[PDB]
């Protein structure tokens, strides 16, 4: 399986972290940094943030069916809007690809890890 079992591993670990996103400083900051760096969000796509109890699309509060602000296009001269990701999951990618990163983080992280291995050895 090689790559495929790797995708399974990564998706499983980041879904687990998302489900406990607000209990883990380590994972919280890890996910925040990864998303802000690779301009990505989640596993297969940003929809994964729906499995967090606060961001589920049938949740009561306003964090429902939205995505944490680290998935917005942070590389702008603008200041941080915490609510930039709200109410974006029920809508299909191209509506919000101007507002948030839509690709998942698994694939982007793995393609970077591959193409930047020439320096990793020696």
């Amino acid at each position: 399986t090689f790559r495929q079992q790797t995708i399974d591993f990564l998706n499983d670990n980041i879904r687990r972290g998302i489900e406990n996103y607000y209990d883990d400083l380590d994972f919280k900051n890890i996910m925040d940094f990864v998303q802000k760096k690779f301009k990505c969000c989640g596993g297969e796509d940003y929809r994964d943030w729906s499995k967090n109890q606060y961001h589920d699309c049938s949740a009561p509060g306003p964090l429902a069916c939205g995505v944490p602000y680290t998935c917005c296009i942070r590389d702008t001269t603008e200041v941080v809007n915490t609510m930039c990701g709200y109410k974006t999951i029920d809508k299909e990618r191209f509506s919000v690809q101007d507002v948030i990163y839509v690709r998942g983080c698994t694939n982007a992280v793995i393609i970077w890890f591959m193409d930047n291995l020439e320096v990793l050895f020696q």
């Epitope: 297969e44 929809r47 729906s50 109410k87 299909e92 509506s95």
Partner: antibody
Framework: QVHLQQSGPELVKPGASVKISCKAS????????INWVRQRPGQGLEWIGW????????YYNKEFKVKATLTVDKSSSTAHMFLSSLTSEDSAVYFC???????????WGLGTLVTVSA | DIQMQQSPSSLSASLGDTITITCHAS??????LSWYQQKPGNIPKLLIY???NLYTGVPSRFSGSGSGTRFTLTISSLQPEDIATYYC?????????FGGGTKLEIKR
């Protein structure tokens, strides 16, 4: 060639159940949502709920959560809406729709007419 | 919890004239809003998406704009084939809701 074909019109006795099927074509099925909308014969459009095939997640309007259940079969590239405990009011036309790459509902099904009648 | 209200319950005006329909929201929905047209004896077609933009294939005489709470769809140089019933929906927060439906009649 983005098209949605629904089931043929259905007739059911009161209290029975119906399975409406919606086959999609022209686009990657798993990537886009499917919405369902019901129009009673003499009224406007009324919103059932949404379902995303790639994850299987579902959201319902509160009114229809009891009476309807939404499913998908990715291999068929088809969505289904199952209605149960049908009332004399539930006789209506049901549409399955796929929205445009931007927010609007671009592609509407022709409509499946379900008549609850003895 | 987000209910739509359409202003002209039934509105008839003459050809060539400019008419306007209003769609008021219960809560701020920013720009997430859509307009559809339903010719009688026909399935609905998409008319306007995202408040301002027009869906492909719509004649340019249709225009729409507004802000969060209140929106307007305006038809200039009205034509007979535009006899239909017109609807608006919101999409910001699920569950999506529709409008009351506004009937359009020509005066001839």
């Amino acid at each position: 060639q983005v098209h949605l074909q629904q089931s043929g019109p259905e007739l059911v006795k009161p209290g029975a159940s119906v399975k409406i099927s919606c086959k999609a074509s022209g686009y990657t099925f798993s990537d886009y949502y499917i919405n369902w909308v019901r129009q009673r014969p003499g009224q406007g459009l009324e919103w059932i709920g949404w379902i995303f095939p790639g994850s299987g997640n579902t959201y319902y309007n509160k009114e229809f959560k009891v009476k309807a259940t939404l499913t998908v079969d990715k291999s068929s590239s088809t969505a289904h809406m199952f209605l149960s405990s049908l009332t004399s009011e539930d006789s209506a036309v049901y549409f399955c729709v796929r929205r445009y790459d931007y927010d609007g509902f671009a592609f509407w099904g022709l409509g499946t007419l379900v008549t609850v009648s003895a | 919890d987000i209910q739509m209200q359409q202003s002209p319950s039934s509105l008839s005006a003459s050809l060539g004239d400019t008419i306007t329909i209003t769609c008021h929201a219960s809560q701020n929905i920013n720009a997430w809003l859509s307009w559809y047209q339903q010719k009688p004896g026909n399935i609905p077609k998409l008319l306007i998406y995202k408040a301002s933009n027009l869906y492909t294939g719509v004649p340019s005489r249709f225009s729409g704009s507004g802000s969060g709470t209140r929106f307007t769809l305006t038809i200039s140089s009205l034509q007979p084939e535009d006899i239909a019933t017109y609807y608006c929906q919101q999409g910001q927060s699920s569950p999506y809701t529709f409008g009351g439906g506004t009937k359009l009649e020509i005066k001839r």
